[PDB]
Each structure stands twice: as C-alpha cells, then as structure tokens.
Swiss-Prot record, chain A:
Assembly and binders: Part of the 13-subunit RNA polymerase complex. Interacts with TFS4.
Organism expressing this protein natively: Sulfolobus acidocaldarius (strain ATCC 33909 / DSM 639 / JCM 8929 / NBRC 15157 / NCIMB 11770)
Gene3D superfamilies named among the record's database cross-references: 2.40.50.150, 3.90.1070.20, 3.90.1100.10, DNA-directed RNA polymerase, subunit 2, domain 6, RNA polymerase alpha subunit dimerisation domain, RNA polymerase Rpb2, domain 2
Name the UniProt record assigns to this protein: DNA-directed RNA polymerase subunit Rpo2
PANTHER family assigned: DNA-DIRECTED RNA POLYMERASE I SUBUNIT 2 (PTHR20856)
CDD domains per the UniProt record, alphabetical: RNA_pol_B_RPB2
Enzyme class label: transferase
Pfam family, one: RNA_pol_Rpb2_5
Swiss-Prot record, chain C:
Cellular component GO terms, alphabetical: cytoplasm; DNA-directed RNA polymerase complex
Location (main, coarse): cytoplasm
Domain of life assignment: Archaea
Protein's recorded name: DNA-directed RNA polymerase subunit Rpo1C
GO MF terms held by the record: DNA binding; DNA-directed RNA polymerase activity
GO biological process, one term: DNA-templated transcription
Lineage start: Archaea, Thermoproteota, Thermoprotei, Sulfolobales, Sulfolobaceae
Curated annotation (Swiss-Prot), chain D:
Part of the whole protein covered: 39 to 81 of 105
GO molecular function: DNA binding; DNA-directed RNA polymerase activity
Record-stated family: Belongs to the archaeal Rpo13 RNA polymerase subunit family.
Quaternary assembly: Part of the 13-subunit RNA polymerase.
Keywords assigned: Cytoplasm, DNA-binding, DNA-directed RNA polymerase, Nucleotidyltransferase, Transcription, Transferase
Residue ranges with Basic and acidic residues bias: 32-42
A Gene Ontology term for the protein's cellular component: DNA-directed RNA polymerase complex
Name listed for the protein in its UniProt record: DNA-directed RNA polymerase subunit Rpo13
Name of the gene: rpo13
GO terms under biological process: DNA-templated transcription
Subcellular location as annotated: Cytoplasm
Keyword Chaperone in record: no
Task of the protein: DNA-dependent RNA polymerase catalyzes the transcription of DNA into RNA using the four ribonucleoside triphosphates as substrates. In vitro binds dsDNA but not ssDNA.
Top-rank lineage group of the source organism: Archaea
Swiss-Prot record, chain E:
Protein known as: DNA-directed RNA polymerase subunit Rpo5
Keywords assigned by UniProt, alphabetized: Cytoplasm, DNA-directed RNA polymerase, Nucleotidyltransferase, Transcription, Transferase
PROSITE patterns assigned to the protein according to its UniProt record, in alphabetical order: RNA_POL_H_23KD (PS01110)
Annotated compartments: Cytoplasm
GO annotation (BP), single: tRNA transcription by RNA polymerase III
Gene Ontology cellular component list: cytoplasm; DNA-directed RNA polymerase complex
Keyword Ligase: no
GO molecular function: DNA binding; DNA-directed RNA polymerase activity
InterPro entries tied to this protein: Arch_Rpo5/euc_Rpb5, RNA_pol_subH/Rpb5_C, RNA_pol_subH/Rpb5_CS, RPB5-like_sf
Catalytic activity: RNA(n) + a ribonucleoside 5'-triphosphate = RNA(n+1) + diphosphate
EC assignment: 2.7.7.6
Family: Belongs to the archaeal Rpo5/eukaryotic RPB5 RNA polymerase subunit family.
Length: 1101, 66, 98, 43, 76
C-alpha cells in the first residue's frame, strides 16, 4: 500500500537522477563510447590499388572541445558561451590512430587529426556536464538548462527524434482488393550505410513471388531459395514450417521452380533479370554479388552467411501463409512493437559512417596518386581532415540529412522554458487516418494531448514523463544466452527430423522462439522460457535491454525477444503475489536518500518494459486495485502526460481539445527563457518583466524548474459579462494594472554581420561610416552611427536607421551593404558586441530592445486552452469593484465556459483564491489534488470570503450593486507573442515588380479567386475593375489594327510604330492589365500567335 | 524579476513588504499569519507576495556589460 | 458425397498442380445465389411497410426480381438510373441526393 | 455514326429555314418526318 | 418494360411544331440553345420522340406545383 507521497518519491528520484532530456544524452553517449569505434571497425582496413601499400585503423579518440585560433595553434579549449557569442561550433577534435603499411611492414602507429565533431551539451564529451553550480555561473552558463542540443555556427540545433517502422522485421498485410495480389509481406533490411526493402507476395494462384530493389520483376520463392543454397524441395518445405496443412501451400511455387534443379540454374535465372546481354559466367557472378550484398545485408553480405539468409526468407514466407490460412491478423503499423524511434545517436553515427567513407575514398585517391608519382610517405600532410569537419556540420546546420529524410535538426525553440523542453522531447513520425489515431499502446509512452492541430495531428508527439528510449545491446550475447537456456536451433530441429526419424507432431506443439524478428529456434513451452529470461534480467545476470514476450494465440504460440535500440519503454513496479516488490524500507531509503531510482531498477524492484512485453502484462493503477492476478503497478498514474500536459491544473475536468490547444499555445507564452538572456544573443527574444509562479501548481511544475523560469502572471479573474467587449472568446483587461506593469514585456532583435574577406589584393569589407559611395541612403540615416561604424548602446532607433556601417568592394567603386533597421520596428539599442571569427573576420552583433505594453488586440491564453485577444482596456474606476474593493484584472465572458466544457478553469480560479487567502500550497495534479474542492471551499469560508468563490460586486460606473453575485478567481494567464504591434500589414501606392509590374515589397494583399468571385456575386463591375485593374498592373498598350500584335509609341516622332507593319499601319491604344500583356508576350515567345482583335469602345449601335 | 512596487489590482505598495514576509516565511512561520499581521488582507496583494520568484538575484551574475 | 454437409471432387485431365489450384480458386469464387453486385440486404421497417436496404447497386437485376415493384426503387448512384430511367429522372435523383 | 451528325445538320438547317419564315409549319413538319423516316431506315 | 410510371420520371410530352415555333420565337433563341435530351433516352423512346423535336416536361416542384421545361431532341 504505497500512498501518493511514496510513489511521488520514486517519480522524483527518477526525474532527479535521470534528467528530463535523457534519450538524447543516452544515445549520444552510446555513440561516443561504442559506435565511434564500431564505424572504424566495420570499415576494417584501408586497401589501395597498389598491392604493397596498406593502412590499418587502430583506435579513435576525442579530445576536449577546442578551436584552432591560428594556422598552427595549440587548440585552446573554449566554453559553450564563447561558441554562442562568436558563432563558433562547440565541437571536439578526433584523433584516429592508424598505422601505415609500406612494403608490408607495420612500422610505428601514428594518430592523426581527422576532423571536428559537434558534441551534445551536458553529455560525456563536454566538461560542463559535471561542473558545479558556481562554476557554471562563473563560466557563463545557465545552471538549469538540461542540455541535449548542439551549438552549430552559433545556433542551438537539436536533433528531433524520428519515428519509423522497425527495420529487419517482416510485417504482413492483405493485398489491395480486386487485384491478383492477395497477401503482402515487406521486410526492411538496414545495412551499414544502405537500406533495402524486400517484398514477398502471394498471387491469386498459390505461387509466391519475391522481389527487391535491384532485380526487376518477381523472382519465384523456390528459385531464390535454391539460389541461396537449398538443394531439394524437401529442405525448403521443412524450412518454411513443420505443419503439413501450411506446408501444402508451397507446392505450386515448387513446381513453378521445378525446372530449376541446381543452384546454378537459379543463379543464372536471377542473372538474366539483373543484367542481360553478358556471358553466363558474368551473369552468374552478377547474380552472386546482387544476392549477397542487396538481398538481406543485415544478416550478412559474405557468401558464408547466405545459407542463413535463406532460412530467414523461409520464415517470412511462413507468416504470409499463416496470414492466408487465417491463423494471424495483419500486423499493425501503429503498434509500438513495430515502431522504433531513432535519436541523435543512430542518426549521428550513420552520418559519421558516410563522412568516414568519403574521407577514406579521398585518402585512397590521394595516397595512390602520391605513390604512382612518388612523394612523402607520411600521412600527416595527406589528412584532409575538413572532409569530415565540414560534412557533419553541413548536416546539422541545414538539417537536410544523408539518408534522404529532411528536417532532422531544428533550431532550438526558446520562447520560454516549456517550449525548449517540449522541442527537446519531440518525436516526429516519418509517415493516413489510421496513423493519426491515438493507439492504446501509447499509454505511458506518448502524451495523448500534446499534438499539433492540422496536417500534423497525431504525427508529432512528445515523450511521456516516464518514457525511456532503448539504447540497445549486441545481439550475440542474447543469442548465446537463449541457446544456453535450451533453445534448439531451427537447422538442428530440421536435421533431427530428417537425419533421424522423429515425430513431427512432437515439434509441432513446441513454441517458436524469435530474436529481433528473426526465427531463432524452438522451445518446450513459451511461458517457462519467458519467465526464465525475465528472472535472469531481474537478477542482473542478463542485460536490462532485453524484453521477452509470449504470444500464445490459440492458432500459434511464439516467443519474441527484443534487444535492439529505439524501443520506447516505460518503468513499472513489479508485483508478485499481489504485493509490489518495492516495500516500506525501500521508500524510507528513498526519502533518506540512501538509494535512488537506478538502485531500485538494479535491485529488480522496478523494470522497464516495451510494448511487446507489455502485451502479456496486467497492470493496476493503484495499490488498492492490486490483485494476485496483477503483474505490474504504475509508478505514477498521472505520468501518461507530457511536459506540457502536466502544466494544466485539474486537466481531467477539461475537454480533450482544450488540453490539446493548451499544449499547442503554451509554447508561445512570454516569460524568462533563460537566466543568462542578457549575455546571450538570440535573433528573436522575449522577456516578461514581472512573471509570477502559478498559485495552483502541479507536482511536476517544480521538477521541471518552471516556477524558477515562469511564463505568466496570476490575474484576478471575474467570470461575468461586464461590457460586451469580451464576447466571442475575448477578454477585458484592467488598464490600471497594465499601467502598473501587469504584462509589460520586452522584445529583442539581433542584427549581426561578418567582415568577410574574399579573394583579391587585401580586399575587405571594412566597417566604417559612409561618406559618398554608391547606394548611399542619406546623411540623416547615419546620425547615430559612431565613429568606428557601429551604433552606440542605449540610443533610440527609429524606422530605417543604420546600425553597422559597412562598405563592400564589387564582386565583378564601394557599395553599401550597411544594415538598415526594419522599417516597422522601432526600439532602443540594447547591446553591441564585437568579436573575431575563426577565419579572422570581424563579427559585429547589435541587439535592439522594444517595449511592448499590452493593448487592444494582444493575445492572451490561460492554462486550459482559452485563447483570446484583448477586447478593451478598462480603468480601475470603471471596473466593477467588490465590497472589499478588489477589482478584476481580467474579465472573461461566462458563455465561453459551457460549450468548451472547461470546468478546470473554474476549479483553478477557486484554487487560486484559496491559495492566496490561506497561503497554503495547492496541488492540482490530475487524479490526485490536495486539498479537495470541499475543503478548499470550507477554508475559503473560514478566511472571510464566500465558499462558492462568488462575492458581492458593485457596478463601478453607476455605483449600484449588481442583482447577483459574481465569481472571482486568480486563474493563471500567459501573454502570447502574437502581438498586434507586428501583425499589421497595410500598403498605399508603392513599388512594383520589375517583371509583372504588380505591387509587392510594403507588399499588398493578394485579392485572389475567391474574393474575385465574391465581388462577382455582388454584381458590381466598376468595383471589380478598380480592385483588379486600376490598383494593380494598370497599363496601356498600342495594338496594330491589321495584324493585332502589340506595338509601341515613339517619343521622338508622334507616329505610332508596329513591330511587323512598320509605320504604314495605324495603332490604337487599349487599356489592359500588364499581366495580360505579359501573358501575350510569353505566348508569343512560344510559337503561339495571339492576335488581339480591337472593337469600338462605344456601344455604337 | 524584482517585486513590483504596487499591487497590480489595487495600487497598494507591496514592495516594502517583500523582505519581512520572505525573511519570516523562510524562518519557519506559516505565510497566512505573517501576511495577516504584516498588513495585507486583500488576496490580490497576497497573490503578489506569495507568488513571486525574485529572478533578479540570479540575473545580477548574467548582466549585460553595456 | 463423402461426409454429410461435405463432398469431394476429382478430375481426369487436371494436368499441372498450378491448374489444380487455379481450379480451386475458380470453385471458391463461384456464386451460389443472388444477383451480381449486392453484398448484403437487410429488411428494415419504415412504418406499416418493410423495405430492403441493399449494400449493392444493380437496378436492372432488382427490377427483374419477382415481388418488387419497379415504380418505387431508390438507388444511391445516379449513373445507372440515367442509363435506365432517362436524364430527367437522373436530374431529379441528383437534386434529391444533394 | 455519320448518319446522326448528318441528321443533326439537316434538322438544324430546317429549323433555321423555319426561323426565316421561308415556308409554313406543315411543310416543315413533313420535312422533319421525311428525314427521320429516311435516315432511321438506314439505322 | 415501362419506366414512365416511375416516381422519379416526370411527365414527358411531345409538342406540335406550331407550339415549338411560338416557343422559340417568344424565347428569342435558336432551338439548339435549349437544354437537349438524347433521342436514345428511354423516356424519349417511350413517347417516340424524334430528333429535331422539342419535348415539354412537367416536373413536380414544391414552389409552383407543376413546372414546365422544354428539352431539345438530338441525334445520339
Ligand atoms: Zn501591324
Ligand atoms: Zn492589492
């Protein structure tokens, strides 16, 4: 019987020892510790065309973060703040110890600098991870930032988690209706550096066709089986399955491959399709390479492993037959047993793999050129390290990835704390109305509320509070432990049925055992093996990354063992005989601090399980719901939510769209995004001058540090219809409160330039105030520019004033590239920063601050999804005051409540009133709130106000008491960054495009087809002519009478001139849109010849 | 960041009450009695004193050179 | 006959087993009763009269069925009624469906 | 199908001739019936 | 089979040439400018409509009760 505090102790220990962003750090640490050497070893060796010369790659190492200040500097170490300020990359060097082989001698090993890799913040690589708070303050870093992002070119880029279907596993599904295809199975083999999809189909006839990317057409099943090493149909049949009823469906395929008796017949049958026109030996060789390296490379590309691959293929075919016979349903693409999440580790190691392949290619080229020409044998001068250094960076800065996926790395969102945390903990689905649907498997792994509205609904999710992404372990150890446990190999089973006479029905009742989707063997009973694996993992003998499940469907029973990475797994308290393994002593030790969550999971009390293992788990929400049948217990019932869904107080009383909208619009709220915002240089920054921590606070608010970086203020809220400016989701705000700094904010904009040097004779874009060079803006615009060419801090900047004076020599005589402050934006210069870039160019940054006072039209939102602009600002005298004289800060229309069904807002109002009155903390965590509503109302009555939170209100304007009481509360409000100050776009007569002669850049509003049809529907004609012809591309063109081609007027001689007719023809002026003339001339650039036919402007008659 | 000079709802000075209230609450006294005897009875001022963060203490380390 | 509610079929010129399996697929995809295009028909009550709601659309076939009046037949699709009942009936059905 | 297009041509020519009041209604009706009988016999 | 008894089918009639002449003169249109019905349509074939004729169709409408529309008979 663990009460609320006991379970919250476990949850707090989890969030304390393990950070909020742990998946990124875990993946990056796994990459650095293992994958960095794994890529080198899978590369193996550097072999050149010349036989004697060779290179062996011994070991790899990363140094502390540093930069090359000079050409041959000692690589002094830097801090992440310096990388941010100087637009550097927080990267660390890589030294690879490769030993050169010349004339088949080993020689002495040498380590060379192969490139810089960007490192994740707060990881094992950077030193700031373990620094104390005071040292973090001294260096200049915010002590509370969780890390998990790279600093690339001065920008915080974070690799979003990418969710996709599991590779190396076969998924079966029905074929499209009304087609010769009846069943389909697709397997995606993820090799080292490339990915191959193999598609297995069953036609209307029971023949089975296997195809993959390089081989056109469909290869028969038995043909490809014989090509892989199988010699007669009996081996194929027994490899597919052991049940005669399911074995009988392979006969048509076997007799379709009856002509193929030997392996070479299958080989050259494939080779005919692979490449046609060469000799039989070349066909056989080509088929051999494509089968070895393009069929199932995850099993292995060597010819030795080929036989193994064949077995795999047979197993896949088995599933199709099981789908056809009706034994199994098609696999769900949405089940998390089928979906894997790739973090920065897997992606970044793939990127390093491709970069190292390119580097080795270039090194081989240069080495062979040097050898055939004759040069220095040393590898230090042939390193060409930048081939890696730029490449990785080019992937992180742009976000366009090597594998073809896009948007891998995004600039970190720092509007406030919540936006940064959510953007760190984000999983984007690569891929239908079925995939968008919320799946029951998402319980405890993804937040059900946090999802964008629109085309991305259900495709972008946030990792849950207690959700962990698997790191992964080597398959070999799990294979060995499974074989040692007693699993009989499939080839051994087939041999002992064939070589020795045994009962087939004896092994038909056995349970199949799979490992990572590959048929591993057979076992006596699935339940016993699953229990053995679970107990071995719990006792610590087996690794904790192994998850075992037992299906035991009446038609088929199997054992699935998973140890691969990317599985989203959640921790559950193990419950044995109706009593959880965690006991009172464990909770006492947690409270004292003797043991932590990691000690609990190591001891076997709490275990992380995946979806597949949770398939046969039976879980209880609370200890009072626990029964002996139950297998697990939940550490925290309200941990199914995300970072933002845990912000809401009493979220179970709201409607689900309200919570989703709250999650969407809580990232936009203004607040303190970082404690070091003053030294930091961000392109768009916001600051709330007086932010307040919520009065109604959930448990997780203090964990994420939100109450130390708040993004709003408590507002005295009255739910009443005071004037009518709060209708249709609008609010009324006290203007006296605004004049006292209620929601005043500051907006920071950054303008930065580099004094770039380009090839020439000492040619540089020196920063200096301008005197008489071309493109000169005007002497009035340079009034506030200092002598050195950059504006001094704390000066008013209005309109298009220049901040940095730069002159540029022509690329093909000075030109003005000086920075003009945006025309709409007006503000005061806040900060001026001057640095030297790595390449030696002068970098200047100017940050300008603008004060935003709330006004009519500014958008505000509560913690429940009630977004709305400010209808009006009302003085304190006009607002309706109470008997105690307290006037509302925000008035909200009651009609917004019943259709939206947001009871949590009224509950939060009452809770905030109670919190302010009694002063005691209020906890509004879903499913467990302290105190309850009734005690809150009783205490509110005791303190001196009405129990139902209403109170007597007098009309401020007339002084007359209202006939009814008005509810008053302290609901938390946030100011969104969609201000009306920067949301105005209005155009008078101005510039037009050079080509189309239409107005843009201030640009004009596009009228468009739908507005054109509205104007047509009203029947107005001159209004259409005004709105579509007079105010845009109004032109007059002279058209020849006879041919009709557009002519011109000659200014020298009053006579009109026709391009075709010369001077002999008469030309008439016609007023048309210039877009029509452009269309006519573009058709004339074709061979189309439009001849415009003129007619009398008058009706004539 | 720094406590507002006046309560947002009613123009009552609460800035001078931050130091006594914070010092006495940190000393081990329940905020209700401290607020009641300090001289703030309207809950509009209580939410001003109760829900304050004092960010200015952290910011003085990270101050713009200017 | 084999067992009751079962039977067995043998062939003389069966030739290849591929032909045998194609023959089996032909046998399974053989219609026993009912006109083409209809998946299921459900009797429903509309008030003192019972009608049939049909998941398929075959105007001519249903018109040929004995026991159904040709005068009152409603079809979801507008093309077959245009082919059978002319263009004015098609226009009326289009308006009524919208 | 050329018969249908030619019949359409003849019918529209007869209608335009009627709209110009070249001849009365009854003769035009005879022409319509005659052309319909003649070129439906082929079909 | 007879389809003119169906509820969806309005009342189709073939009007004489004098009425068609009066109609086209009052409307001020060429006969082909009217909406046209194919001569192979079953409703036109039932009344024996011939190409070049004009069919008067009375539909049941809730606004006027019976509405009179004119169609043109075309060839195929
Ligand atoms: Zn001309
Ligand atoms: Zn106050």
């Amino acid at each position: 019987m663990l009460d609320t505090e006991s379970r919250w102790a476990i949850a707090e220990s989890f969030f304390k020892t393990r950070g909020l962003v742990r998946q990124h750090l875990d993946s990056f640490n796994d990459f650095l510790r293992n994958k960095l050497q794994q890529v080198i070893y899978e590369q193996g060796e550097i072999v050149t065309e010349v036989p004697g010369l060779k290179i062996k790659l011994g070991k790899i190492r990363y140094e502390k973060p540093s930069i090359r200040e000079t050409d041959k500097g000692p690589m002094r170490e830097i801090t992440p703040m310096e990388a941010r300020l100087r637009n550097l990359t927080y990267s660390s060097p890589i030294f690879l110890s490769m030993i050169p082989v010349e004339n088949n001698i080993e020689g002495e090993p040498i380590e060379i600098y192969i490139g810089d890799l960007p490192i994740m913040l707060k990881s094992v690589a950077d030193p700031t991870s373990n620094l104390p708070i005071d040292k973090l303050i001294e260096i200049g870093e915010d002590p509370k930032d969780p890390g998990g992002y790279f600093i690339v070119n001065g920008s915080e880029k974070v690799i979003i988690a990418q969710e996709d279907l599991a590779t190396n596993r076969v998924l079966v599904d029905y074929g499209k209706s009304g087609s010769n295809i009846t069943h389909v199975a697709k397997v995606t083999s993820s090799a080292a550096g490339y990915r191959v999809q193999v598609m297995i189909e069953r036609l209307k006839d029971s023949t089975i066709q296997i195809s993959f990317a390089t081989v056109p057409g469909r290869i028969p099943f038995a043909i490809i089986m014989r090509a892989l090493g199988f010699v007669t149909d009996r081996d194929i049949v027994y490899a597919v399955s052991l049940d005669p009823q399911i074995q009988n469906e392979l006969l048509p395929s076997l007799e379709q491959a009856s002509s193929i008796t030997s392996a070479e017949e299958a080989l050259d049958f494939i080779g005919n399709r692979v490449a046609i026109g060469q000799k039989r030996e070349n066909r056989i060789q080509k088929a051999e390479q494509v089968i070895d390296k393009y069929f199932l490379p995850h099993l292995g590309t060597s010819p030795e492993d080929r036989k193994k691959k064949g077995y795999y293929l047979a197993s896949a075919v088995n599933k199709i037959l099981e789908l056809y016979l009706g034994r199994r349903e098609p696999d769900d693409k949405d089940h998390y047993a089928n979906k894997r999440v790739r973090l920065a580790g897997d992606l970044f190691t793939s990127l390093f793999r491709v970069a190292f392949k390119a580097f080795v290619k270039d090194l081989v080229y240069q080495l062979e050129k040097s050898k055939v020409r004759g040069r220095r044998l040393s590898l230090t001068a042939l390193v060409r390290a930048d081939i890696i250094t730029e490449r990785i960076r080019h992937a992180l800065a742009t976000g366009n990835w090597v594998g073809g996926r896009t948007g891998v790395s995004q600039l970190l969102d720092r509007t406030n704390w919540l936006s940064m945390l959510s953007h760190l903990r984000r999983v984007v689905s690569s891929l239908n109305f079925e995939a968008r649907d919320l799946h029951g498997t998402q319980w405890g792994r993804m937040c059900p509320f946090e999802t964008p509205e629109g085309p991305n609904s259900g495709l972008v999710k946030n990792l849950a509070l207690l959700a962990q992404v698997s790191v992964g372990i080597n398959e070999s150890v799990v294979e060995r432990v499974a074989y040692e446990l007693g699993v009989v190999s499939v080839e051994d089973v087939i041999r002992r049925i064939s070589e020795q006479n045994e009962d087939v029905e004896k092994y038909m009742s056995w349970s199949k055992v799979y490992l990572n989707g590959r048929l591993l063997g057979y076992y006596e009973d699935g339940k016993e093996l699953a229990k053995k694996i679970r107990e071995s993992r719990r006792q610590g003998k087996l690794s904790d990354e192994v998850n075992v499940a037992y299906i035991a469907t009446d038609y088929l029973n199997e054992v699935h063992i998973n140890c691969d990475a990317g599985r989203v797994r959640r921790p559950l308290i193990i419950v044995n005989n109706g009593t959880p393994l965690v006991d009172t002593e464990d909770i006492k030790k947690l409270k004292n601090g003797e043991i932590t969550f990691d000690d609990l999971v190591k001891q076997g009390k709490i275990e992380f399980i995946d979806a597949e293992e949770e398939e046969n788990a039976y879980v209880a929400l609370n200890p009072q719901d626990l029964t002996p049948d139950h297998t697990h217990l939940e550490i925290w019932p309200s941990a199914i939510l995300g970072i933002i869904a845990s912000i809401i107080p009493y979220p179970e009383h709201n409607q689900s769209p309200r919570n989703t909208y709250q999650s969407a619009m809580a990232k936009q709220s203004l607040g303190l995004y970082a404690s070091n915002y003053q030294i930091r240089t961000d392109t768009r920054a916001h600051l709330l001058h007086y932010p307040q921590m919520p009065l109604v606070q959930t448990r997780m608010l203090g964990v994420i540090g939100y109450n130390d970086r708040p993004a709003g203020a408590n507002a005295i809220l009255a739910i009443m219809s005071y004037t009518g400016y709060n209708m249709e989701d609008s609010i009324i705000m006290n203007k006296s409160s605004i004049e006292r700094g209620m929601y005043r904010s500051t907006f920071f904009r950054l303008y930065s330039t580099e004094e770039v040097k380009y090839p020439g004779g000492q040619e540089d874009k020196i920063i200096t105030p301008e005197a008489g060079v071309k493109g000169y803006k005007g002497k009035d615009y340079y009034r506030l520019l200092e002598d050195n060419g950059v504006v001094s801090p704390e000066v008013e900047v209005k309109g298009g004033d220049v901040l940095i004076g730069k002159v540029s020599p022509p690329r093909f005589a000075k030109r003005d590239t000086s920075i003009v402050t945006r025309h709409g934006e007006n503000g005061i210069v806040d900060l001026v920063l001057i640095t030297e870039t790595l390449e030696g160019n002068k970098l200047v940054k100017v940050r300008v601050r603008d004060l935003r006072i709330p006004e009519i039209g500014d958008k505000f939102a509560t913690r429940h999804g009630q977004k709305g602009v400010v209808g009006i600002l009302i003085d304190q005298v006009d607002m309706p005051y109470t008997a105690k004289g307290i006037v509302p800060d925000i008035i909200l229309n009651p009609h917004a409540l019943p259709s939206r069904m947001t009871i949590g807002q009224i509950m939060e109002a009452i809770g905030g009133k109670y919190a302010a009155l009694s002063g005691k903390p209020v906890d509004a965590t879903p499913f467990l709130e302290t105190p309850k509503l009734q005690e809150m109302q009783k205490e509110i009555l005791k303190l001196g106000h009405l129990p139902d939170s209403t109170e007597v209100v007098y009309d401020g304007r007339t002084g007359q008491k209202l006939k009814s009481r008005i509810l008053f509360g302290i609901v938390y409000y946030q100011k969104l960054h969609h201000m009306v100050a920067d949301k105005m776009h209005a155009r008078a007569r101005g510039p037009v495009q050079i080509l189309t002669r239409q107005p843009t850049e201030e640009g004009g509003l596009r009228f468009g087809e739908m507005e054109r049809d509205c104007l047509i529907g009203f029947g107005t004609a001159m209004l259409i002519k005004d709105r579509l012809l007079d105010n845009s591309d109004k032109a007059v063109v002279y058209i020849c009478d006879q041919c009709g081609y557009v002519g011109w007027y000659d200014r020298s001689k009053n006579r009109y001139v026709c391009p075709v007719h010369g001077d002999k023809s008469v030309l008439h002026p016609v007023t048309v849109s210039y877009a029509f003339k452009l269309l006519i001339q573009e058709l004339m650039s074709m061979v189309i010849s439009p001849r415009l036919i003129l007619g009398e402007k008058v009706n004539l008659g | 960041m720094i406590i507002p000079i006046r309560c947002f709802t009613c123009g009552a000075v609460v800035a001078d009450k931050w130091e006594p209230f914070s010092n006495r609450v940190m000393g081990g006294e329940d905020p209700e009695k401290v607020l009641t005897e300090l001289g703030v009875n309207r809950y509009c001022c209580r939410r001003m004193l109760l829900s304050h963060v004092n960010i200015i203490r952290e910011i003085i380390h990270y101050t713009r050179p200017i | 006959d084999n067992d009751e509610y079962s039977f067995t079929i043998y062939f003389e010129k069966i030739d290849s087993i591929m032909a045998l399996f194609k023959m089996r697929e032909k046998i399974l995809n053989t219609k026993i009763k009912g006109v083409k295009g209809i998946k299921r028909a459900i009797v429903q009550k509309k008030g003192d009269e019972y009608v049939i709601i049909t998941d398929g659309s075959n105007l001519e076939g249903i018109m040929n069925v004995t026991g159904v009046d040709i005068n009152k037949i409603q079809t979801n699709n507008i093309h077959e009624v245009e082919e059978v009942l002319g263009i004015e009936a098609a226009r009326e059905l289009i308006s009524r469906e919208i | 199908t050329i018969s249908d297009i030619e019949m359409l041509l003849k019918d529209t020519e007869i209608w335009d001739k009627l709209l110009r009041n070249e001849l009365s209604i009854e003769e035009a009706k005879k022409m319509f019936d005659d052309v319909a009988r003649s070129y439906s016999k082929a079909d | 089979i007879d389809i003119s008894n169906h509820e969806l089918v309005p009342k189709h009639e073939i009007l004489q040439l004098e009425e068609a002449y009066k109609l086209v003169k009052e409307l001020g249109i060429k006969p082909e400018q009217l909406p046209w019905i194919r001569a192979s349509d079953p409703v036109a074939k039932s009344i024996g409509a011939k190409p070049g004729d004009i069919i008067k169709i009375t539909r049941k409408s809730p606004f006027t009760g019976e509405s009179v529309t004119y169609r043109y008979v075309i060839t195929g």
